[PDB]
Every structure is written in C-alpha cells, then in structure tokens.
Amino acid sequence: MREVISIHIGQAGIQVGNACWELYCLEHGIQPDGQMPDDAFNTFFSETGAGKHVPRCIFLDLEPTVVDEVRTGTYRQLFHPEQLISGKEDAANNFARGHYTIGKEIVDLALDRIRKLADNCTGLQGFLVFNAVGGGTGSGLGSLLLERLSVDYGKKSKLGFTVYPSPQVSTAVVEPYNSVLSTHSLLEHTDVAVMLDNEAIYDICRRSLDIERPTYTNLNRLIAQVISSLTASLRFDGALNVDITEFQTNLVPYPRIHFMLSSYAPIISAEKAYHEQLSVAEITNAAFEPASMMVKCDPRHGKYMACCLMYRGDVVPKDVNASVATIKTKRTIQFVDWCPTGFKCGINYQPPTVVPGGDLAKVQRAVCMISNSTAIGEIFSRLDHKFDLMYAKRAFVHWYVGEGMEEGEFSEAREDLAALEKDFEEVGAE
C-alpha cells in the first residue's frame, strides 16, 4: 500500500544498496535466505505465497563485477536474479558511453523490469534512485533512466540520493565533465535530490566514529541509516507521520530548488556511547552542526529555506518542540525571510536498528535532518570552474564526442549550471 521502488545505478548505487538492504532486512527481521520467522515490509519487500520476501529493488549497472558480487555474496537467495541487471561493457567514466551507446538496451530492459515491479504495487509512494554523479554508468545511464521514468510514469515522486564529487579529493579525472552533464540532466527530472559527498562523510567518520581509515562500507552504512530514517515513517507508526509526498510539499518551495543537504545524528561509536546523555536537544544541535552535514558545504554561507527533521526512537513532541524553539532562537542558524516556520518535524516510535558489523552504536534516539538551503549553490560553483578549466582546452572531450555527443551538449550543461547558480543567488537574496 506504501510501496517504494528502489533503483541502484552504478557501482556506488549498488554498494550503498547493499548496506540499505542489509539494514532493511535487519530492521524487518527478514533473514538473508529471503523469508523471516504486519505488512510493515510492504514498502520495501513483496511477499509471495511461500512466505519468502523479495525486495522491490533493481540493481542496474553496465559492469558485471559489482552485480556478480551480490549474486555470489550472502544476499544471493534474497534478490531477484533478473532484477539484478548486468551489462557487458563498462561506461569507462564516459557519460556519452553510458547515455547514448551502451545504455540504450540496458535502460530498455530496466524500464521493462520497472513496469513489472510497479504492476505488483497497489500504491506507489515513489522511486528511490541511488546513483553516483561522476561516473559514466551512474550519471549517463541514470540520467537516461530518470528521463524515461519522467516521460512514462509521470508524476511519481523520484527521490535521487546522488553523490557529487568532493571539493578537493576525488577518484576520477573526467568527473567534473560527467557530473556537469548529469546535473544538467537531473535538474529537470528528479523531484527531490539529496546531495552526498564522500569527503564530508569521511570527515564525519573520522571525527565522530574515530575511524582513521574510513572506507566505502562505512560510508554506505551511514547512507543506509539515513535512508532508513527517511523511510521509517512509511513502515512504522508514530506521532507526526511524514510521507514521501509530504517531503516535496514541506521541503520544495519552487520546482528548480529541490537539492537537499542531509545530516544524521548521533554518530557515535559504542565506546563513546552511554557516555553522554544523548537528549533530543543535543541530537538536534548535532544534526544542525555543519560538520554533521554529509556535503562539504558550510550552511553558514547560505540561509536555510526548509528543514525536515525525522526523529526515530524515544522522542516526545515536547522535546522536539523545545529543541526546534532553541534552534529558531539560535543566531548562527539563519533562515530566509520568506519562510517563517521552515520546519517539518516528524517523529517515529521505531528506534534505529544497529547493523552487527557496523560502527554505529545502539542509540535509542536518532535525527535525520534534510534541509533545503541556498548554501548548496557553492558545490555547483566549485564544479562550474572545475569544468570550464578543462573545457577551455577541450581535454578528454574527444572521448565524449566519440560516443555520439556534441560540444553543444557541454555548452548547454555549463549554461544550465550557471542558470542554477543564478537561481540560488536570487532565492538567497531578498
């Protein structure tokens, strides 16, 4: 009745999907074999007559290795083999390769399976697209898939949990190129886009979890906890229920402005746990701390427009009200003049489940703050010069041209990102 279709595109999408689905299995009691020893799972799993539960997810990638890792690992009897879709040739960090030449047949099969999945859902809250902006598979194929979904499904709410390149640290070289292309693509298709940065999550792990060597598994576990907190109100009852449709209404002031900073709290290891009180006010403050942001974007530079807080566990409305009143009275936290309330508080009675093998402690309270703020334009500003610096020499441009793109596409993407910068400046200004 509250089904949500999960899409995981590219290596990063699949690797965060592994953590997400392990977390969902742990939360709902579903064993990795597929079945558990009501109907709260229906959002993420569809049950069969035999009692065995299959997730409503689709693992899309043009490379076979990542998907075969899932096919060989513990969750081989859980997922649908055809829902795991594997390509033959990788996109090789080429947006054109993933969007024009290789991605065609793969996206056709993906839409086929997505139709089959949506046909099994009475209701459909929306799509959760988890991809990696900065890679040919994630950016190009993901952009094509989002465009097709917008064309055919229509008004279904697509929430894109995208991972943009970090300000200074990165793993690719053409990452500004394909990131600009995919941002051009997804400015007009996704309904609410959640920004994530590897550098910011690395900093969170290093400072809060005391992990001197954070890794992709830790990053994915944090992202999985955040998405679980986001979807908790769909699956578990509690005071002040918040919905996928209500995210857009209480978070998106205008259709272009729908990019969101995400921050989880508390992030504490068990050795540091039960060593602080972890009250509602303190976890709210931690969630509003700039270091707790999962994007290398200081909110002090900009102004908050909206903030949806998702409380999990033993949280009382009096405490959320007191904490939010303190936040409003706080001076460093600054809101736009045209949004006096700017807050969407929603509580859930289900505490965040702890993944065995993870670093997170078993905490009875949690906050997931997803905020629309004009500061997010800074990351686009960074990519806008990282792009044009290479584009001046047309470096690596032959690679993108070879798979059927044009200089006009790069020009249009750069112009649209400049327009997005201007829109962020205009919404920030009085």
């Binding site: 009501d38 109907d39 009852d237």
Partner: protein, 51 residues
C-alpha cells in the same frame, strides 16, 4: 474450499488488524507509563531526604 482467495483475504485483514491492535496496546502501555510521571511521583524525594 472453492473460494480460497476470499478466505485468504479475510485472514490477511484479520492478521493485519490483530497486529496493529498488538502495536496499539504496547504503545498505550508505554504512554500510560510516560504520563504517570507527575508531581506525586517521588522525583525529588531523594533530594528532600538528603536536605
């Protein structure tokens, strides 16, 4: 027996309602415990004894 699907739907509805009833009873007990706290409960009784 010929109408298994109708009986299956009835059983599904009954199970969902029973599970939600169990959840509501548990939450009602927890809320009663939370709302029981008041002035009469000896929250400062130890402080009074010490003074």
């Amino acid at each position: 027996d010929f109408l298994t699907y109708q009986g299956a739907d009835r059983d599904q509805r009954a199970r969902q309602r029973q599970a939600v009833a169990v959840r509501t009873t548990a939450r009602s007990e927890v809320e009663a415990k939370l709302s029981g706290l008041d002035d009469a409960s000896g929250l400062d009784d130890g402080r009074l004894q010490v003074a």
